[PDB]
Design a protein around this ligand. Structure first.
Ligand code: MG
Ligand code: MG
Ligand code: MG
Ligand code: MG
Ligand code: MG
Ligand code: MG
Ligand code: MG
Ligand code: MG
Ligand code: MG
Ligand code: MG
Ligand code: MG
Ligand code: MG
Ligand code: MG
Ligand code: MG
Ligand code: MG
Ligand code: MG
Ligand code: MG
Ligand code: MG
Ligand code: MG
Ligand code: MG
Ligand code: MG
Ligand code: MG
Ligand code: MG
Ligand code: MG
Ligand code: MG
Ligand code: MG
Ligand code: MG
Ligand code: MG
Ligand code: MG
Ligand code: MG
Ligand code: MG
Ligand code: MG
Ligand code: MG
Ligand code: MG
Ligand code: MG
Ligand code: MG
Ligand code: MG
Ligand code: MG
Ligand code: MG
Ligand code: MG
Ligand code: MG
Ligand code: MG
Ligand code: MG
Ligand code: MG
Ligand code: MG
Ligand code: MG
Ligand code: MG
Ligand code: MG
Ligand code: MG
Ligand code: MG
Ligand code: MG
Ligand code: MG
Ligand code: MG
Ligand code: MG
Ligand code: MG
Ligand code: MG
Ligand code: MG
Ligand code: MG
Ligand code: MG
Ligand code: MG
Ligand code: MG
Ligand code: MG
Ligand code: MG
Ligand code: MG
Ligand code: MG
Ligand code: MG
Ligand code: MG
Ligand code: MG
Ligand code: MG
Ligand code: MG
Ligand code: MG
Ligand code: MG
Ligand code: MG
Ligand code: MG
Ligand code: MG
Ligand code: MG
Ligand code: MG
Ligand code: MG
Ligand code: MG
Ligand code: MG
Ligand code: MG
Ligand code: MG
Ligand code: MG
Ligand code: MG
Ligand code: MG
Ligand code: MG
Ligand code: MG
Ligand code: MG
Ligand code: MG
Ligand code: MG
Ligand code: MG
Ligand code: MG
Ligand code: MG
Ligand code: MG
Lengths: 107, 80, 86, 122
RNA sequence: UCUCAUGGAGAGUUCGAUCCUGGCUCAGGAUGAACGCUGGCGGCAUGCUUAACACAUGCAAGUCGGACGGGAAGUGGUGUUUCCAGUGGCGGACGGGUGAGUAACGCGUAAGAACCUGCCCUUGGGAGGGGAACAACAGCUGGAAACGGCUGCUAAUACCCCGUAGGCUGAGAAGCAAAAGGAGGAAUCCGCCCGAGGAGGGGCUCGCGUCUGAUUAGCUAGUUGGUGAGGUAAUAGCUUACCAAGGCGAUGAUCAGUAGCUGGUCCGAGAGGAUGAUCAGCCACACUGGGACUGAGACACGGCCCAGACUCCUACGGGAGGCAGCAGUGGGGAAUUUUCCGCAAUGGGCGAAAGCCUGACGGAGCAAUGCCGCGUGGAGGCAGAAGGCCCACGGGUCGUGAACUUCUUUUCCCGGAGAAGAAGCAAUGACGGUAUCCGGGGAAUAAGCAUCGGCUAACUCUGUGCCAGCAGCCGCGGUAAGACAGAGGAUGCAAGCGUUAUCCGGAAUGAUUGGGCGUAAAGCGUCUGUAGGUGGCUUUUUAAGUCCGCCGUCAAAUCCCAGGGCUCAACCCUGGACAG
């Protein structure tokens, strides 16, 4: 058997496999981000003191960043997007804590 | 990338080339940034304008074989 | 280039104004000049400008589906302030 | 007149109206003859003119003049028609090129032969 | 009488005549032209405008064994060397075609700020330690074929983890992230990861310019703005919820109709009119619609998925396909070419290089399609003859024209030699034994087509008799036709000459330059007045127009000027510039 279509076939298959890889890498981000957000709602609604509850939260946060940048350098994401995702997590983490009350920059 | 090469003009069987600085993905006679040299096999006419060549080679322009060797004969690669 | 001076038709909306710019042009065939009047959505934070005002119009990044332009204090104008009579 | 008025676009040109609409911007068109018959000319020119009704490729039906002396043309013949107007007959704006397709060349014409589609005699 | 100008022509037709207003018609240029008759050559160009209608056949994108595991050709064997599917790497987003859609920031021009960027330069640091898979292969198996299914198996510059990071998130505290080896005996080379620049290529945003229609007058509700959350490479109603009621419009919105736009081309005395073939830039599309995926880059012509329409193969269970790539066939049409040669040149792709692939391109062939050059003889030739035609029969005219005598050979024919184009190591030329050069014959191989009433240059005779016919307009033709047909003669152009179509001209006939409105077409029946346009004198101000200087740019090709090169010209090349 001699098969001749290089470009067509080969690029097709490559596209599939790479697509599965990419799909994984994005799903990861959506997921861990989602856990962070559930944690943040759970915290904003009820009353804890953040000095205590930020520990599980920041473990989840650090995990999230890890997933993000791993997806940047593996190359499924473009860095500038990553920047936005992280910025979002940071913003939510900043929103809840003003509601409960420890920090408030004003100038 | 930016390439310094020949663009083909003149007529059937009688060929004359311009040496031009142009992005590599444009067509062979396509639009360009700067015209620099002049060349031709039959009249054995060759000459260039060196400040331009050097200004492009400085910013990283790659010549093509024929052009490369034309620049060699006129000693533009020594000044480099 | 040269910024466009105009006057404000509608101040009603927030952080915006509606400016009318009048400029003269030498009509292509018949060589007399004509007034062509165009309207602009101008971005004005602080809402300083009211209706009737004479304002200079500046260029910047898009703030909306329309406003590209920053509302700027009148650039230069002949003072309507009384002058000596020698 | 008034400049102010001219700037309301008071000058507009009159477009060129073609003399042979049925041709639709062509040198010639091929057609089939629906009918071949004769007509009398507008007075005081009396004679009997040879005309045929032709249905064209552009779909129209027109009435075209057949030049020369004598013809072999009959119904369901494929001819080629060209422009030009016969001042005599009302409504007739088209001729029939002689010597091509189904219209033969005029027999025994010795002069200005190219107009009538005639070989040069040896 | 210095300087500027190298440019503006008319003619016929209404009347018994005239002057006028006014239309129609002609003389000129130009074709991507077609048709008729005729046709020797060369030079440079050009060649489906219609059906973005169908497509049989062959070819138009691959490369890398120096990323990698295999197996297959030989060889005596892993010393030599080849091919090869497969995984990976970059390339298939450039090049090629077409103008359907698009009245739009699509295009031209000029500005801007919130961006991206593989290959190429410039530069600052690095490349530790492991592990797991998947094709290939093997075995078993389903299929007519296309293509599959199970179980094992294995390498990597292919996948995953940990450590470190002048970067990213964040007020901070903190948190988070990388690698790959292959050549060589070594030196060293080609790579890899993270930053920071540069140039080029792209994404956006805005001023201006960017067709006809009022017998199209209201249109728009994510519509016009604000916040909050999302999203994008980046700004943004890009998305969504809430708040507000705006936005556009008689200077023509919306709706309908047409159209790819621009450098330019044709015409014009100029002002400007018409148009957008070849050639160059940009947009848009790829059987009809819609999606995304991969990727620096696409919503991807010779990739994927779906639906639809249509063609083919089928052992009928299912598959295959997309010429608006080069040629080629059908069809439509007045009409538009060979199923050619070659990678040698230039340009691309991959590669360490050798090199491979390039229907881009370079060439050939077909066609008077067009522009340009040359030829179809030169000099002499009783003033005597044959013949045509006219003739008041005297003669005239075809006519120095032929015949005839000499000279010459561009072209034709038969032989010889024979390039540059090839780029610095030789080698390597599809064109092509072509362009050119030398010899030998020999006037030898080569003229037609319109017109001859006026415009309009060129006239008589026989034949016909309001017939046959001509004609661009006026109009000819009823017995002697300078207007029909024939002959002879002449005139105009000439390898072309005519006819038809298209456009500008003439046309001052849509008028800015450049017209009119008492009676020729034309003053609203008459006022009041809103927008709109113009608006007295004097002094000052400002500097929007206006004016002058300097700078940037308005791509190259074209037009203009000045040289240079093909024997000349057309064509090509260099340099430069008025306009605006
Ligand atoms: Mg040479
Ligand atoms: Mg006037
Ligand atoms: Mg005309
Ligand atoms: Mg009268
Ligand atoms: Mg009369
Ligand atoms: Mg007149
Ligand atoms: Mg003409
Ligand atoms: Mg012929
Ligand atoms: Mg076409
Ligand atoms: Mg086929
Ligand atoms: Mg091939
Ligand atoms: Mg090898
Ligand atoms: Mg090889
Ligand atoms: Mg390599
Ligand atoms: Mg070996
Ligand atoms: Mg292989
Ligand atoms: Mg295989
Ligand atoms: Mg393309
Ligand atoms: Mg293309
Ligand atoms: Mg082409
Ligand atoms: Mg169209
Ligand atoms: Mg429309
Ligand atoms: Mg624009
Ligand atoms: Mg616009
Ligand atoms: Mg654009
Ligand atoms: Mg890449
Ligand atoms: Mg280094
Ligand atoms: Mg390591
Ligand atoms: Mg890590
Ligand atoms: Mg890796
Ligand atoms: Mg080796
Ligand atoms: Mg080694
Ligand atoms: Mg960089
Ligand atoms: Mg136009
Ligand atoms: Mg809403
Ligand atoms: Mg004129
Ligand atoms: Mg074309
Ligand atoms: Mg083009
Ligand atoms: Mg597209
Ligand atoms: Mg088709
Ligand atoms: Mg599609
Ligand atoms: Mg992607
Ligand atoms: Mg493609
Ligand atoms: Mg597609
Ligand atoms: Mg195709
Ligand atoms: Mg389907
Ligand atoms: Mg299909
Ligand atoms: Mg397929
Ligand atoms: Mg084709
Ligand atoms: Mg056919
Ligand atoms: Mg046909
Ligand atoms: Mg032809
Ligand atoms: Mg090559
Ligand atoms: Mg090459
Ligand atoms: Mg290379
Ligand atoms: Mg070939
Ligand atoms: Mg070609
Ligand atoms: Mg021939
Ligand atoms: Mg020729
Ligand atoms: Mg020929
Ligand atoms: Mg012809
Ligand atoms: Mg000639
Ligand atoms: Mg003679
Ligand atoms: Mg001789
Ligand atoms: Mg010659
Ligand atoms: Mg050599
Ligand atoms: Mg000779
Ligand atoms: Mg005369
Ligand atoms: Mg005649
Ligand atoms: Mg005519
Ligand atoms: Mg009589
Ligand atoms: Mg008689
Ligand atoms: Mg008679
Ligand atoms: Mg007589
Ligand atoms: Mg006659
Ligand atoms: Mg004659
Ligand atoms: Mg002609
Ligand atoms: Mg005019
Ligand atoms: Mg008129
Ligand atoms: Mg008048
Ligand atoms: Mg009257
Ligand atoms: Mg009147
Ligand atoms: Mg009155
Ligand atoms: Mg009246
Ligand atoms: Mg009235
Ligand atoms: Mg009044
Ligand atoms: Mg008023
Ligand atoms: Mg005023
Ligand atoms: Mg005044
Ligand atoms: Mg130019
Ligand atoms: Mg010259
Ligand atoms: Mg010369
Ligand atoms: Mg030039
Ligand atoms: Mg200028």
């Amino acid at each position: 058997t001699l098969k001749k279509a290089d470009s067509a076939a080969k690029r097709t298959r490559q596209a599939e496999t790479r697509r599965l890889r990419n799909k994984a890498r994005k799903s990861e981000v959506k997921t861990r981000m989602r856990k962070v957000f559930e944690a943040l709602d759970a915290l904003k609604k009820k009353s804890g003191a953040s000095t205590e509850e930020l520990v599980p939260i920041d473990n989840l946060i650090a995990e999230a960043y890890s997933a993000i940048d791993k997806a940047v350098v593996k190359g499924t994401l473009h860095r500038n997007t990553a920047a936005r995702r992280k910025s979002r997590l940071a913003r939510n983490k900043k929103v809840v804590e003003i509601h409960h009350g420890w920090y408030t920059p004003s100038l | 990338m930016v390439k310094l090469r020949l663009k083909r003009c003149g007529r059937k069987q009688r060929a004359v080339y311009r040496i031009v600085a142009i992005d590599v993905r444009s067509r062979r006679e396509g639009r360009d940034l700067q015209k620099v040299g002049f060349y031709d096999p039959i009249k054995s006419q060759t000459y260039l304008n060196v400040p331009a060549i050097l200004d492009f080679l400085e910013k990283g322009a790659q010549p093509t074989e024929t052009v490369y060797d034309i620049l060699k004969r006129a000693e533009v690669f020594k000044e480099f | 280039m040269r910024s466009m001076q105009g006057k404000v038709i509608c101040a009603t909306n927030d952080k915006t104004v509606n400016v009318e710019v009048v400029r003269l042009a030498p009509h292509p065939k018949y060589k007399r000049r004509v007034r062509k009047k165009k309207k602009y959505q101008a971005h004005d934070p602080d809402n300083q400008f009211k209706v009737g005002d004479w304002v200079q119009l500046d260029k910047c990044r898009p703030i909306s589906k329309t406003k590209t332009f920053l509302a700027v204090a009148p650039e230069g104008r002949q003072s309507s302030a009384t002058r000596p009579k020698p | 007149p008034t400049i102010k008025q001219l700037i309301r676009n008071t000058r507009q040109p009159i477009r060129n109206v073609t003399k042979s609409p049925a041709l639709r911007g062509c040198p010639q068109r091929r057609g089939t003859c629906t009918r071949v018959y004769t007509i009398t000319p507008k007075k005081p020119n009396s004679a009997l003119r040879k005309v045929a009704r032709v249905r064209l490729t552009s779909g129209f039906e027109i009435t075209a003049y057949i030049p020369g002396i004598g013809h072999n043309l009959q119904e369901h013949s494929v001819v080629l028609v060209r422009g030009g107007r016969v001042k005599d007959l009302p409504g007739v704006r088209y001729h029939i090129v002689r010597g091509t397709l189904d219209a033969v060349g005029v027999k025994d014409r010795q002069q200005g032969r190219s107009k009538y589609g005639v070989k040069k005699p040896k």
